[PDB]
Amino acid sequence: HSACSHVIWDSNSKLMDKSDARHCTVIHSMSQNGWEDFAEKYDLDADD
Amino acid sequence: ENRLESILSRFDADWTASDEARREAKNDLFFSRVSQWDDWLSQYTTLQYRGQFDVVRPVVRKLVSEMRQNPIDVLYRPKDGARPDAADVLMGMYRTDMRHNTAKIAVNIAVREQIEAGVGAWRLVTDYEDQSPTSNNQVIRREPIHSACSHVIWDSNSKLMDKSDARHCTVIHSMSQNGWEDFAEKYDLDADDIPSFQNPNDWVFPWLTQDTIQIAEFYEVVEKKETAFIYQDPVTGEPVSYFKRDIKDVIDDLADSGFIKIAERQIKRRRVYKSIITCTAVLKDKQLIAGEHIPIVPVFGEWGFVEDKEVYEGVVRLTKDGQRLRNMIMSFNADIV
Amino acid sequence: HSACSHVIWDSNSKLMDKSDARHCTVIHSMSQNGWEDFAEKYDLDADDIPSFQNPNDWVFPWLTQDTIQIAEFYEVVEKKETAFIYQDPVTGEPVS
Amino acid sequence: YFKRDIKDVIDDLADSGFIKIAERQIKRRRVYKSIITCTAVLKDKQLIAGEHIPIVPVFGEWGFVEDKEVYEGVVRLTKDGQRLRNMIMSFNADIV
Amino acid sequence: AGEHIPIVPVFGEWGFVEDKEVYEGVVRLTKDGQRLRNMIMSFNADIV
Amino acid sequence: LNMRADLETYVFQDNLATAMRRDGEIYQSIVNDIYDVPRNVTITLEDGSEKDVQLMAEVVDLATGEKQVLNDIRGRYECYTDVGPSFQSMKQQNRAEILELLGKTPQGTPEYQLLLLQYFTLLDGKGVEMMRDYANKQLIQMGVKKPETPEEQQWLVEAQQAKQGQQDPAMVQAQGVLLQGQAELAKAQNQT
Amino acid sequence: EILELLGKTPQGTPEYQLLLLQYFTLLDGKGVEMMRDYANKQLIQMGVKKPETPEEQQWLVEAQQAKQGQQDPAMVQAQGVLLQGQAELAKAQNQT
Amino acid sequence: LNMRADLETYVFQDNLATAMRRDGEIYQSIVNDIYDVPRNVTITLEDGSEKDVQLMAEVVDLATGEKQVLNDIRGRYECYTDVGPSFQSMKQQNRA
């Protein structure tokens, strides 16, 4: 959600299912406190 | 073939097909501007008003919705006097590997571009996959050919629309760098190289992807036929059935083992060899594709011939005249206000 | 398609059938590469490069690289072929 | 027939007391979610259970112009007239 | 006593402008058109 | 037209890659229970394919493996090219045929076979399962289904001849009211 | 051809023969294969289609014969209604 | 369409993620250690894979637990992705 500004995906993909790409990426927006607990699960930097 | 020395036959047939890839292809992307992106053609970023109207986009979306809500897909029907369960054979193997959504997406892409740019296409490919195998862990998938506006090079010197008798046709695939690496996995090409074909994409050099790799696969006609040796079935009954021998080239040895029969036979096959060639040199020559007819069947909108040249137009060709004119008068009166 | 550009038929014929016309002919234009492969089919030379009067377009809304005109002319001779009358014992129906 | 995908555990107990042949390659594809920032990749190749990407984009009016991906809403053409209408509306307001 | 936050806000159309929250009922910018009528009403009352 | 032109290149593509898929054959009986020798215009005693299931070699559908796989008939044509509405399930095409035959069949038994068949092509559930089993019972056991027995000789064929044998005397008793007319003639003959 | 004859022929035995034959000319499936067999049930009994597939030795012809044998004793009882009048003649003159 | 694309990868994700579940049939759990390698798929008793129904089972599908947990069927695929009216229970599904 907020994919008027989370849209960075694909480039040349001829499918709408996004499974013909591996250059694709998505970007999300979360809070400062939310980043700290998100870093526990996925083994990331706590604050960055 | 058209000529002896295959590389010359490709490149000379490309010359005659350059009518489509130069002039017609330039005008084809201009349909897609008025439809998808912005009303003006070759606009500039300005600090002054630039108008839009477009009755065209509600009309295009209405027409595209009709062909999507009434999709046309493979159904099959028995031959002349044939058994009624004949259709269910080929449909059984069709519905298993077309379970994947890449097939249904390709139908919806083909119908929208047919109206807009007057052209559209799709290709059939075969690969090894076991996320929906049919038999022998071999499936057939429908991959969309999308961006038919800037992928038109194909031309027929026959007056047919099917393009399954042609040998002067070629399609071009304009893809990004990562896509060129995946395209080289299947067809045994170069992962990174950046070939350029004749580039029927840019002319006025508008907004476009950073990485553009033009690669063109060609479809020639080389018969190659087949002959000789009746075979048998000691597996699943009914021995003495005619089976291929020159289509296969490994299986044929073991097919003669355990059982053999001879009475000769001649069957004339028209086979298409997919060669992937660039203008400078042939990148990979004479890969036998599973199809013996061209798997690329383009759909056309309003269509016909000049003389010995395909000509086609969508519904957006004549609207380029009126729409840019409507904006000129609008944008001038914006300054007065 | 583009039979208009291929008009070399009729003149004062009162029929449109052209299956009994005295001016029964067709013409087709094709590329340089297309003349060569079509010459294999019709058992002709591929370097002949025939030309015609030119019924084809002079308007030219779009260029065509190569047009090699050949007109296959249909001729009529009666022949009057027959050999006797023969019988058919296989699946009945003799005397044909 | 049972997976190899994350099976490195169950397989030993599964060989005992029951086994079957007809072993053959089964092609699968596995997608890998990698958390990344501009500076460096924070986590690379963290296994996500999907065999295809679990993110499906939706597009209402979609296409290419030269193989540069383009889409839009219905908002673009309507907003073009809104700001223009609003401008005329605000001019004559001050005259009242 | 909950096991989730028991407070559920109801929204109309809901989303972000980009990163700032925005939502609307049936009154959002309805306020604009009401003020144009009020403008003409107030000024012409003074003339009368 | 171009969709039908796809079906031209489909038979010469799919059958090279996928291949196999023998059809019209059941009792596909594997290395020398095989023959095909018998008899003009009729097939009697087994065969080696060619219908029956008997002698315990029933198949759903099987195909030749030879000594090496990737083999098929040279003539890959089988079907006239025709296209229409999308189908991606076998049961979806079956339902479309049932519904097409409905709305032009008269009330009573001709329309009633289509209704039971509609339930049978529909899936199971909690509720939907009962309607499918109601069709499974009526259609298969009465012998109006007339299956080709591809995987059916379990609990279905078992009760099938029992229900068929129950059906015939029950119809004779229902025609008993017409036997009243025969009774008048039986009196006149016996009184003589 | 079957659909062309339908919708212009009144109800009766010909209308019923067309209706069954429509099922027979259509595809097979799980569902559709039944209607082809249901066609052969009633059509062969009327003898208009005539019995076909003598090569059958599986199920079909067995079950087809059972439905024919169901119809036979029921038909004899139906003819006795007109025989009530003929029966009265015989018993009347016999007693006296 | 893209909802059905999400559901294509849902099957390939869910059987790992939620863990277990099978797409197999009756005779589950019960003495087996059988296969269909003799003959090739036969029906009418050999202990019962699917060769019979409803003898010491009444359950059509049951999750695969093996002898150690966190396992699933390899062939997750079985069904087709198709859109109908909205449902979120089996009871709701039956109403329509």
Supply database-style keywords.
part of a larger assembly; 8 chains; 48 residues; mainly alpha; elongated; viral protein; virion
Describe what this molecule looks like in 3D:
This is part of a larger assembly, with eight copies of chain A. Chain A has one helix spanning 32-41. The first copy, chain A, is an all-alpha fold and 48 residues long. Chains in contact: A-B, A-D, A-E, A-H, B-C, B-D, B-F, B-G, B-H, D-E, D-H, F-G, F-H. At the B-F interface, β1, β2, α4, α7 and β11 of B face α1, β1 and β2 of F. Chain A: This is Portal protein. Chain A: Belongs to the p22likevirus portal protein family. Chain A: It comes from Salmonella phage P22 (Bacteriophage P22). Chain A: It is found in: Virion.
Q: Topology, pairings included?
A:
The structure is cut from a larger assembly and holds eight copies of chain A.
Chain A: H1 32-41
